[PDB]
Design an enzyme around this catalytic site. Structure first.
Site, PDB file in Angstrom:
ATOM      1  N   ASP A 289      -4.242  12.072   8.098  1.00 42.96           N
ATOM      2  CA  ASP A 289      -3.653  10.861   7.515  1.00 42.96           C
ATOM      3  C   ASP A 289      -4.305  10.556   6.171  1.00 42.96           C
ATOM      4  O   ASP A 289      -5.399   9.987   6.131  1.00 42.96           O
ATOM      5  CB  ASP A 289      -3.849   9.680   8.465  1.00 42.96           C
TER       6      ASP A 289
ATOM      7  N   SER B 112       4.765   8.155 -10.125  1.00 41.63           N
ATOM      8  CA  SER B 112       5.863   9.071 -10.360  1.00 41.63           C
ATOM      9  C   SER B 112       6.609   8.663 -11.618  1.00 41.63           C
ATOM     10  O   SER B 112       6.668   7.486 -11.985  1.00 41.63           O
ATOM     11  CB  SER B 112       6.812   9.051  -9.170  1.00 41.63           C
TER      12      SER B 112
HETATM   13  N1  LIG Z   1      -2.329  -2.339   1.146  1.00 42.53           N
HETATM   14  C1  LIG Z   1      -1.251  -3.054   0.923  1.00 42.53           C
HETATM   15  N2  LIG Z   1      -1.319  -4.317   0.591  1.00 42.53           N
HETATM   16  S1  LIG Z   1       0.304  -2.290   1.055  1.00 42.53           S
HETATM   17  C2  LIG Z   1       0.522  -2.034   2.847  1.00 42.53           C
HETATM   18  C3  LIG Z   1       0.455  -0.617   3.356  1.00 42.53           C
HETATM   19  C4  LIG Z   1      -0.496   0.270   2.876  1.00 42.53           C
HETATM   20  C5  LIG Z   1      -0.613   1.543   3.405  1.00 42.53           C
HETATM   21  C6  LIG Z   1       0.218   1.969   4.432  1.00 42.53           C
HETATM   22  C7  LIG Z   1       0.013   3.311   5.086  1.00 42.53           C
HETATM   23  S2  LIG Z   1      -1.499   3.136   6.087  1.00 42.53           S
HETATM   24  C8  LIG Z   1      -1.779   4.703   6.787  1.00 42.53           C
HETATM   25  N3  LIG Z   1      -1.192   5.782   6.339  1.00 42.53           N
HETATM   26  N4  LIG Z   1      -2.623   4.745   7.790  1.00 42.53           N
HETATM   27  C9  LIG Z   1       1.189   1.092   4.891  1.00 42.53           C
HETATM   28  C10 LIG Z   1       1.305  -0.181   4.362  1.00 42.53           C
END
Ligand SMILES: N=C(N)SCc1ccc(CSC(=N)N)cc1
Ligand SMILES: N=C(N)SCc1ccc(CSC(=N)N)cc1
Length: 330
Positions: free
Chosen positions: A35, A199
């Protein structure tokens, strides 16, 4: 040193990918979800609440002669889908594809949420975002990649996810046979702890490329491609009968449709996601409505280049002093 491990879709829709990981002495092999959007290595374990384990392989630290309890340390994390897990922490030897780290923090779950229990194919997570996001308290721990980096031939890892097929995670080297053309590198911001990049735009099918900056994260732990509403509406407008369904939770389309490709920019280079990669199959068993693989990021707070996008490319996560991302077609 280097390592190389095969990563395999958990199901016929590529809903996630699992990679075997050796933990402890003698080795205990667990299948983890690598991840790049989080920074904890956590596992189902002999400490996990019994009713919350349903078919996963567990780590049993008492059977590992190299395991040591990290005194006083706990962890607790949430994921983009609202799932969560928490527990205590051991250090142990962890190997991926022949690359070994001693003293890696292995976060043993005492509690997992229902979506983890219900998925028997995923035995835990291996986080590959920046260690500043690691949740262990009171002493934050390093990711597997951070711990390995000084020993690697080059301070990189690569993601080569397959479409309905196995793929590869490599550590420490770039397999020049695994991609076509050149790798285009692009700047990363680590300010939010993610592999965050911009991007340079997009195209839908054979349409003209729209030059526009799209900031988002390279996230192997997210299945779909989440982009701004304007972009996603432009995509689905090219699919007859596609609509955004409030009750289903996203764009759906007739399963009889042939989907157009989606191109995203990396500098002056272009990565093409074939239309088939955007089909996530019936919304419920037997339905003729199918769930789209490109969805709006509105309400999530960030754009996410998840597996739908990453699987169309060979992706370099360059963890040099100034990190960068690389993308190649393949
Ligand atoms: N940080 C923020 N304010 S944006 C919210 C957000 C961030 C990241 C993810 C993926 S987490 C993962 N891959 N474990 C999903 C949502
Ligand atoms: N809470 C609910 N209303 S359903 C919860 C639930 C979800 C999925 C399954 C099938 S996967 C499995 N059995 N491990 C079974 C139960």
């Amino acid at each position: 040193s280097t390592g190389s491990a095969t990563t395999t879709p958990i199901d016929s829709l590529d809903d996630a990918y699992i990679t075997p990981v050796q933990i402890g002495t003698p080795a205990q092999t667990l299948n983890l979800d690598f991840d790049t959007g989080s920074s904890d290595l956590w596992v189902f374990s002999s400490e996990t609440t019994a009713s919350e384990v349903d078919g996963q392989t567990i780590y049993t630290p008492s059977k590992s002669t190299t395991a040591k309890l990290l005194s006083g340390a706990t962890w607790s994390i949430s994921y983009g889908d609202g799932s969560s897990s928490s527990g205590d922490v051991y250090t142990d030897t962890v190997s991926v594809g022949g690359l070994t780290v001693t003293g890696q923090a292995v976060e043993s779950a005492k509690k997992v949420s229902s979506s983890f229990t219900e998925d028997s194919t995923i035995d835990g997570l291996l986080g590959l975002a920046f260690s500043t996001l690691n949740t262990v308290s009171p002493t934050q721990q390093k990711t597997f990649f951070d711990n390995a980096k000084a020993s690697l031939d080059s301070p990189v890892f690569t993601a080569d996810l397959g479409y309905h097929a196995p793929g590869t995670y490599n550590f420490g080297f770039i397999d020049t046979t695994a991609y076509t053309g050149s790798i285009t590198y692009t700047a990363v911001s680590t300010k939010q702890g993610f592999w965050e990049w911009t991007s340079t735009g997009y195209a839908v099918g054979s349409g003209t490329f729209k030059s526009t900056s799209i900031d988002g994260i390279a996230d192997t732990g997210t299945t779909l491609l989440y982009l701004p509403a304007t972009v996603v509406s432009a995509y689905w407008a090219q699919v007859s009968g596609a609509k955004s369904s409030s009750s289903v939770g996203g764009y759906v389309f007739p399963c009889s449709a042939t989907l157009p490709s989606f191109t995203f920019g990396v500098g002056s280079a272009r990565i093409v996601i074939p239309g088939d990669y955007i089909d996530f199959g019936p919304i419920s068993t037997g339905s003729s409505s199918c769930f789209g693989g490109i969805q709006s990021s509105a309400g999530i707070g960030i754009n996410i280049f998840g597996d739908v996008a990453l699987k169309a490319a060979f992706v370099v996560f360059n963890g040099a002093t100034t990190p960068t991302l690389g993308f190649a077609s393949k």
